[PDB]
Amino acid sequence: ETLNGGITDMLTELANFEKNVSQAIHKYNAYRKAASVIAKYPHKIKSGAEAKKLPGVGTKIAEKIDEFLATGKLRKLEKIRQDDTSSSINFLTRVSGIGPSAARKFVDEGIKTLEDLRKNEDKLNHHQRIGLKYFGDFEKRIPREEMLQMQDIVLNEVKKVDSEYIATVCGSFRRGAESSGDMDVLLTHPSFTSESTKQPKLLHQVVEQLQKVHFITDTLSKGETKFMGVCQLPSKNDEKEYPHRRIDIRLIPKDQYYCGVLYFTGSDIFNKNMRAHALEKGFTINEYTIRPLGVTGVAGEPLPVDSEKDIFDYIQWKYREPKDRSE
Template identity: 55%
Template sequence: MSKRKLQPSASNPNQDYCDFLLELADFEKNVSRNIYKHNAYRKAASALSRHPVRVSSGSEARQLPGVGRKIADKIDEFVQTGRLGKLDKIRASDEAVAIGQLSRVSGVGPAKARELFSAGVTSLEELRRRPELLNHHQSLGLRYVSEFEARIPRTEAAALEGHVCSRLAALDPLYCATVCGSYRRGAESSGDVDFLLTHPAFTSSVNEKPARGSSANQKPAKGSAANQKPAHGAAANEKTGGQLLRAAVDQLKNEGFITDTLSHGDTKFMGVCLLPGERYTVHRRIDIRLVPHDQYFCAVLYFTGSDEFNRQMRAHALEQRFTLNEYTLRPLGATGTPGEPVPVTSEEEIFEYLQYPYRRPEERSL
């Protein structure tokens, strides 16, 4: 089920532990459908990957955040036997192996993988012989499965970011795009490159209008701020997310950078891209999420992560009588009801509001 196995190395002396934990995480997500265990295994693997020395026992591993007794027991079993009984059983299950393989395809979730298995598909090779079972996104995901799984070196991720930002600036210098996730936290390689995009003409108040449609009784979109004023200079030039995202994607398509579309909504685009130049030969999946301008820096903070850093910062926000999420920072009233979003024009301002020492993105991998 695991995409590849690596031995302990100087860069990650606990790589083999991380491998089996991530394989267990995939099983829990795709086969058992237990997201709680999935997240627990991934959190433990993340803590082990950042630990600078080799862990020699479960009790030693338990000193790390996110490593509980059951995971520590698995580490002890692996140290003593060089294998894991639970993984042996998983690998002996035709259904588990098939679902793990099929779930590698972009657009094929656990439910679709089970459906394919029920239809007699047990491998990627068999799936390639049954194209009628896949939609457009899944067909492209199957075509590029190996390329999408390849890690993206930091130098290439930086080139992707630079190319997208320069092409959007040529279209309209008011576009702003940021690559978040582990790349922004300084990782040497990334699994994907996800862009957050914004423009002053698109605010949460603009976003709410199409969400409401013609019904006066329809609830506002999640995270919207109905009474918040648009960014300075944007009121007279309001644009919907669909207009702005479509223009941005068309610009990148015209340059030949985006080669295929996986899906395209009003505020989220997923596609396939390839950097120009002979040195770039691997197609990458590109995700572009358009965020209202007044919510952009809360989104940048949230999608930069890490998950543990976000959890700690949200807990601190509550202590300071604020509620913080990917959309807004809001003060809590005397009854605990969130008030209107406070204006945020940078990540640093969020830290200042919360009286929380600023941490640069590369200091947030907890």
């Protein structure tokens, strides 16, 4: 956690680089498991050979481990870090919609900068166009203060549209968080569950309302259950317009709402921990349900959930407010 820190950090840098700059899923996979185990190792690694005894650590990494222990650096790391091509890919990739694949491509053609991106907006698809457009605004955290206004809006419209809608804003924001990255709204409705062969309109009506009053300003991807756009609080009385925010809305079969809400609310750690617990308690938890375990090794039969409670009850835990879902 701090004993194997640089080691695991160097390893991750290395890993990540294989994967993006080059396309060596293998090495890239190498560094990762390695970085994974040395991370667990409960002792201060004092040398390569010592490391080496680890599962996943072979001679290559061992060597890196030595150089790094020996001199506080690494050559390949120094080299990479400097490498303009690689720097370039790492950067382009920051545009929402630009992944490694495309990043490499552009570079190839020679678009290495944000400005390059501009004169070449033609080479870019819709998503990427929007990502380019709100590059600054997207990089910005969302102050909770704003979160409350946004939530405020979405709730009112949702409701005006149909009163049968149930929406919950998940994420860190749900957990108390001072700021958040984007708004996640989980939605479900009664007339829509596991069976009841869809009802696309259900998601669409709402998106439509939202855009209607100018909350949603762009569509990154809209399908029949997941809408991915951009929103913005009305830039009030001039002098201060708001930053364009990322928003995601998902439609859920009402019969698997709370599992989902449970899930998305996190945190990753509360999850895993909540999940690990369900197991002893003789169950299984996932993004959509909770099924009792059966001795034959496994089992199914999706238990009926009416609120975040029932799930707790099931695994017979203490209801933990979202606020304290931290781990």
